[PDB]
Scaffold this active site. Sequence first.
Site, PDB file in Angstrom:
ATOM      1  N   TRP A  95      -8.519  -2.336  -0.371  1.00  0.00           N
ATOM      2  CA  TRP A  95      -9.348  -1.055  -1.006  1.00  0.00           C
ATOM      3  C   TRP A  95     -10.217  -1.451  -1.607  1.00  0.00           C
ATOM      4  O   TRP A  95     -11.022  -0.411  -2.311  1.00  0.00           O
ATOM      5  CB  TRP A  95      -8.273  -0.043  -1.569  1.00  0.00           C
ATOM      6  CG  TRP A  95      -7.503   0.722  -0.475  1.00  0.00           C
ATOM      7  CD1 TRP A  95      -6.322   0.700  -0.279  1.00  0.00           C
ATOM      8  CD2 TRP A  95      -8.313   1.814   0.030  1.00  0.00           C
ATOM      9  NE1 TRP A  95      -6.007   1.802   0.653  1.00  0.00           N
ATOM     10  CE2 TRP A  95      -7.156   2.368   0.902  1.00  0.00           C
ATOM     11  CE3 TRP A  95      -9.344   2.485   0.166  1.00  0.00           C
ATOM     12  CZ2 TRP A  95      -7.359   3.536   1.731  1.00  0.00           C
ATOM     13  CZ3 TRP A  95      -9.376   3.564   0.983  1.00  0.00           C
ATOM     14  CH2 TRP A  95      -8.346   3.913   1.741  1.00  0.00           C
ATOM     15  N   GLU A 153       0.738  -0.981   0.061  1.00  0.00           N
ATOM     16  CA  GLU A 153       0.155  -0.223  -0.031  1.00  0.00           C
ATOM     17  C   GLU A 153       0.982   1.287  -0.005  1.00  0.00           C
ATOM     18  O   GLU A 153       0.625   2.119  -0.622  1.00  0.00           O
ATOM     19  CB  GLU A 153      -0.854   0.045   1.279  1.00  0.00           C
ATOM     20  CG  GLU A 153      -2.004   1.138   1.261  1.00  0.00           C
ATOM     21  CD  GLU A 153      -2.509   1.467   2.312  1.00  0.00           C
ATOM     22  OE1 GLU A 153      -1.910   1.299   3.668  1.00  0.00           O
ATOM     23  OE2 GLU A 153      -3.709   1.853   2.571  1.00  0.00           O
TER      24      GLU A 153
HETATM   25  C1  LIG Z   1      -5.436   1.784   7.579  1.00  0.00           C
HETATM   26  C2  LIG Z   1      -5.503   1.020   6.558  1.00  0.00           C
HETATM   27  C3  LIG Z   1      -5.594   0.340   5.193  1.00  0.00           C
HETATM   28  N1  LIG Z   1      -6.843  -0.058   5.039  1.00  0.00           N
HETATM   29  C4  LIG Z   1      -7.896   0.721   4.219  1.00  0.00           C
HETATM   30  C5  LIG Z   1      -9.082   1.448   4.970  1.00  0.00           C
HETATM   31  C6  LIG Z   1     -10.105   1.859   4.277  1.00  0.00           C
HETATM   32  C7  LIG Z   1     -11.521   2.043   4.819  1.00  0.00           C
HETATM   33  C8  LIG Z   1     -11.644   1.861   6.230  1.00  0.00           C
HETATM   34  N2  LIG Z   1     -12.754   1.752   6.836  1.00  0.00           N
HETATM   35  C9  LIG Z   1     -12.902   1.506   8.037  1.00  0.00           C
HETATM   36  N3  LIG Z   1     -14.051   1.378   8.888  1.00  0.00           N
HETATM   37  N4  LIG Z   1     -11.910   1.013   8.985  1.00  0.00           N
HETATM   38  C10 LIG Z   1     -10.677   0.801   8.572  1.00  0.00           C
HETATM   39  O1  LIG Z   1      -9.757   0.542   9.261  1.00  0.00           O
HETATM   40  C11 LIG Z   1     -10.494   1.286   7.135  1.00  0.00           C
HETATM   41  C12 LIG Z   1      -9.412   1.210   6.364  1.00  0.00           C
HETATM   42  C13 LIG Z   1      -7.383  -1.200   5.403  1.00  0.00           C
HETATM   43  C14 LIG Z   1      -8.347  -2.011   4.959  1.00  0.00           C
HETATM   44  C15 LIG Z   1      -8.838  -3.099   5.477  1.00  0.00           C
HETATM   45  C16 LIG Z   1      -8.319  -3.760   6.750  1.00  0.00           C
HETATM   46  C17 LIG Z   1      -8.910  -4.893   6.814  1.00  0.00           C
HETATM   47  O2  LIG Z   1      -9.919  -5.600   6.483  1.00  0.00           O
HETATM   48  N5  LIG Z   1      -8.172  -5.710   8.028  1.00  0.00           N
HETATM   49  C18 LIG Z   1      -7.715  -7.071   7.878  1.00  0.00           C
HETATM   50  C19 LIG Z   1      -6.713  -7.062   6.411  1.00  0.00           C
HETATM   51  C20 LIG Z   1      -7.158  -8.500   5.574  1.00  0.00           C
HETATM   52  C21 LIG Z   1      -6.481  -8.454   4.386  1.00  0.00           C
HETATM   53  O3  LIG Z   1      -5.250  -8.272   4.459  1.00  0.00           O
HETATM   54  O4  LIG Z   1      -6.937  -8.713   3.402  1.00  0.00           O
HETATM   55  C22 LIG Z   1      -7.151  -7.382   9.121  1.00  0.00           C
HETATM   56  O5  LIG Z   1      -7.510  -8.234   9.929  1.00  0.00           O
HETATM   57  O6  LIG Z   1      -6.343  -6.693   9.444  1.00  0.00           O
HETATM   58  C23 LIG Z   1      -7.071  -3.177   6.915  1.00  0.00           C
HETATM   59  C24 LIG Z   1      -6.382  -1.891   6.520  1.00  0.00           C
HETATM   60  C1  LIG Z   2      -9.620   5.403   7.155  1.00  0.00           C
HETATM   61  C2  LIG Z   2      -8.370   4.891   6.414  1.00  0.00           C
HETATM   62  C3  LIG Z   2      -7.188   4.669   7.040  1.00  0.00           C
HETATM   63  O1  LIG Z   2      -6.003   4.620   6.668  1.00  0.00           O
HETATM   64  N1  LIG Z   2      -7.361   4.316   8.300  1.00  0.00           N
HETATM   65  C4  LIG Z   2      -8.460   4.454   9.423  1.00  0.00           C
HETATM   66  O2  LIG Z   2      -8.371   4.141  10.318  1.00  0.00           O
HETATM   67  N2  LIG Z   2      -9.624   4.797   8.532  1.00  0.00           N
HETATM   68  C5  LIG Z   2     -10.985   4.593   9.022  1.00  0.00           C
HETATM   69  C6  LIG Z   2     -11.433   5.656   9.845  1.00  0.00           C
HETATM   70  C7  LIG Z   2     -13.169   5.520  10.029  1.00  0.00           C
HETATM   71  O3  LIG Z   2     -13.417   4.289  10.766  1.00  0.00           O
HETATM   72  C8  LIG Z   2     -13.398   5.082   8.365  1.00  0.00           C
HETATM   73  C9  LIG Z   2     -13.410   6.185   7.617  1.00  0.00           C
HETATM   74  O4  LIG Z   2     -14.738   6.970   8.010  1.00  0.00           O
HETATM   75  P1  LIG Z   2     -14.792   8.275   7.886  1.00  0.00           P
HETATM   76  O5  LIG Z   2     -14.601   8.867   6.798  1.00  0.00           O
HETATM   77  O6  LIG Z   2     -14.235   8.872   9.086  1.00  0.00           O
HETATM   78  O7  LIG Z   2     -16.274   8.709   8.189  1.00  0.00           O
HETATM   79  O8  LIG Z   2     -12.075   4.239   8.095  1.00  0.00           O
END
Ligand SMILES: C#CCN(Cc1ccc2[nH]c(N)nc(=O)c2c1)c1ccc(C(=O)N[C@@H](CCC(=O)O)C(=O)O)cc1
Ligand SMILES: *c1cc(=O)[nH]c(=O)n1[C@H]1C[C@H](O)[C@@H](COP(=O)(O)O)O1
Lengths: 264, 264
Positions: free
Chosen positions: B80, B58
């Site tokens: 994503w 990422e």
């Molecule tokens: C921050 C950031 C990047 N991101 C992007 C990102 C985008 C929208 C979000 N939305 C919400 N509600 N929470 C987040 O933390 C979030 C994070 C992430 C997205 C998903 C996972 C996740 O599903 N966690 C699993 C990973 C499984 C996998 O590898 O496919 C885990 O158990 O950790 C982690 C980071």
């Molecule tokens: C967004 C992406 C990231 O890298 N890390 C995070 O923790 N998030 C989280 C915050 C929130 O739970 C959600 C985004 O929602 P909002 O825009 O704050 O309403 O993903």
Amino acid sequence: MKQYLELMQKVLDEGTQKNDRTGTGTLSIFGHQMRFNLQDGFPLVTTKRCHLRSIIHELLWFLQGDTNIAYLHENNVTIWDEWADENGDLGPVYGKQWRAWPTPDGRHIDQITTVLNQLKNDPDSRRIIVSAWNVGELDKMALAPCHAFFQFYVADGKLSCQLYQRSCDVFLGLPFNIASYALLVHMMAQQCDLEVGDFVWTGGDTHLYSNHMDQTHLQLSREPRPLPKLIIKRKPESIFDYRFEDFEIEGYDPHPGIKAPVAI
Amino acid sequence: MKQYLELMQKVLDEGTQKNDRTGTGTLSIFGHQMRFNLQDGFPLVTTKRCHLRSIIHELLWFLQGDTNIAYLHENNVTIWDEWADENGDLGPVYGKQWRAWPTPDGRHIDQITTVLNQLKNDPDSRRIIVSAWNVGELDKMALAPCHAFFQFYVADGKLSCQLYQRSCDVFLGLPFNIASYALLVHMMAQQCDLEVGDFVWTGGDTHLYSNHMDQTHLQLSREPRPLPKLIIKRKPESIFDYRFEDFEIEGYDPHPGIKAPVAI
Ligand SMILES: C#CCN(Cc1ccc2[nH]c(N)nc(=O)c2c1)c1ccc(C(=O)N[C@@H](CCC(=O)O)C(=O)O)cc1
Ligand SMILES: *c1cc(=O)[nH]c(=O)n1[C@H]1C[C@H](O)[C@@H](COP(=O)(O)O)O1
Ligand SMILES: C#CCN(Cc1ccc2[nH]c(N)nc(=O)c2c1)c1ccc(C(=O)N[C@@H](CCC(=O)O)C(=O)O)cc1
Ligand SMILES: *c1cc(=O)[nH]c(=O)n1[C@H]1C[C@H](O)[C@@H](COP(=O)(O)O)O1
């Protein structure tokens, strides 16, 4: 204030000597946070007398979307004189960015109106933010934004605000900054029928200038007094309709003021 | 990690129940700051197994200035997916803003290169900042930037960085955000021949989703293991020339993984 004097002492104890932009030299630390429960009183420094008129007029000037010191001069506020040009302009600083952030396609975003509408229509939002850090207009600003990014938050009918200050002159600027933001939160809360919560201050490069050492030591020997109370005497039709005459401060009994040169 | 687990407990101890955009509901606190001394070890959560593979890809993706998930997909990263459109686009998010912030006068600023130049030529500057918060383009973004603004600082030959994360999903997002930035600091420091200092994390709306409670208490019952060590096997010509293979994490013995649903 207790937490202000503690930061002041921390800078003296753990600060690193740095040759800064002004060539004055500073003692600095990186990364610090403070929280002020606005319910406990207005965070206006009592260990040295601060002047409200300058703080109030600068904030009202910001909200107007004004970047020229003319207004400030009509009200005897001289704080921005050393950075304004021959025509009194400071460039597209705080004021312009708050009310008219320019989009790449010619439009303008009014961040304050957006924030007002968010506090009223979507208080649980995690995006209630105002940013003055416009990367594309930084080179056109007399001085890069010190207080550059702030976020509002609403919980239990209380409005909180966190500021990220990238650069902080602990002796001169910090007292002004804290009071300015505490003030805005009160005005916002009043316009959105909310109670005041906390003001969380977060700093980046937090420093004490070498030629403020005596003044700092003087201040550190004074005992903080009970915080004052802010009273807004009128409720305007909008956040842009406040006047200097609407603010009153009760119980402000500070120690005498301390004079110190500004680093240009 | 000790700092991370204390944050979780704090959210639980003094968080307020709030409704949110996703309709899930959260336990939330506003304003927090923690520091990680990078010399102590690479800050990758050990109380649950994290997958460094996705974290690394990422970051390289961000540095390329990419906002389409194709690259991620060819590397088996699906983090994503839920926010990408039919074409895999996320809009002008992180990658675009870091590498090509659009100005009103038709220019584009590469904040990463500017920062690198600042660390090499003017490390004492108090303006070494990268912002993802482009107010004028927020409406085109699939999701508003969570990690929105970061600042670098140099002292005693050590590079430090403070990140302001406006919204934070403590259970899922935070472990990712911490490791990602700690990795960026190491890469930046290697390019500027500096030692790694501190990574300071500051949060706005810091929350735990209602459907992460069981997982949170399960994690809290665990004792952190010793932090892993990060080894970079090569020094590329530019910060944009790193490959996944240049990084090696050693001594990482985490507790078992804990699955939790992501809020869209
Ligand atoms: C921050 C950031 C990047 N991101 C992007 C990102 C985008 C929208 C979000 N939305 C919400 N509600 N929470 C987040 O933390 C979030 C994070 C992430 C997205 C998903 C996972 C996740 O599903 N966690 C699993 C990973 C499984 C996998 O590898 O496919 C885990 O158990 O950790 C982690 C980071
Ligand atoms: C967004 C992406 C990231 O890298 N890390 C995070 O923790 N998030 C989280 C915050 C929130 O739970 C959600 C985004 O929602 P909002 O825009 O704050 O309403 O993903
Ligand atoms: C922050 C901010 C806004 N500003 C703008 C601003 C711009 C550049 C800066 N530059 C430096 N080096 N430090 C600052 O704190 C600073 C502040 C201020 C400017 C001056 C004073 C000042 O001289 N204060 C006197 C009072 C003088 C008066 O009342 O006219 C004092 O002793 O308090 C305070 C705030
Ligand atoms: C800037 C203005 C403000 O509102 N608050 C402040 O404390 N300052 C200080 C920070 C620094 O001492 C100087 C600005 O210089 P630089 O851009 O950081 O080099 O004024």
